[PDB]
Design a binder for this molecule. Structure first.
Ligand SMILES: *[C@@H]1O[C@H](CO)[C@@H](O)[C@H](O)[C@H]1NC(C)=O
Lengths: 50, 51
């Protein structure tokens, strides 16, 4: 998917990636420690999956 | 969308006027010339759905 959808779903920063989840149905992939920081500071986000 | 490709103004192999059209197209996208043309040809009849 990501090879076919470059400059569409491939954001270049974490702050614009969390915002893209905050706008559309976006399922951003990143490191687990920062997700444990964002989810505890934002009650509209969650960590699904292991 | 399934794929993501694009149309393009074709030039011969190694042409100098490829670069001037490259500058020209991006000028008309920011001032909205192409979107006034895309709404002029692909529209033309306001439909009914509204339900
Ligand atoms: C989701 O999180 C905040 C804090 O819980 C909430 O107030 C708001 O509705 C959402 N934030 C947005 C939409 O930026």
């Amino acid at each position: 998917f990501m090879s076919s959808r470059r400059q569409s779903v491939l954001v270049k920063s974490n702050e614009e990636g969390i915002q893209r989840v905050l706008t559309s149905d976006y399922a951003f992939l990143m490191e687990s420690t920062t997700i444990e920081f964002v989810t505890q500071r934002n009650c509209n986000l969650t960590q699904i999956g292991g | 969308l399934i794929d993501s490709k694009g149309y393009g103004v074709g030039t011969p192999m190694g042409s100098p006027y490829r670069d001037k059209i490259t500058i020209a197209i991006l000028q008309l996208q920011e001032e909205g010339k192409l979107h006034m043309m895309k709404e002029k040809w692909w529209r033309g009849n306001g439909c009914p759905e509204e339900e």
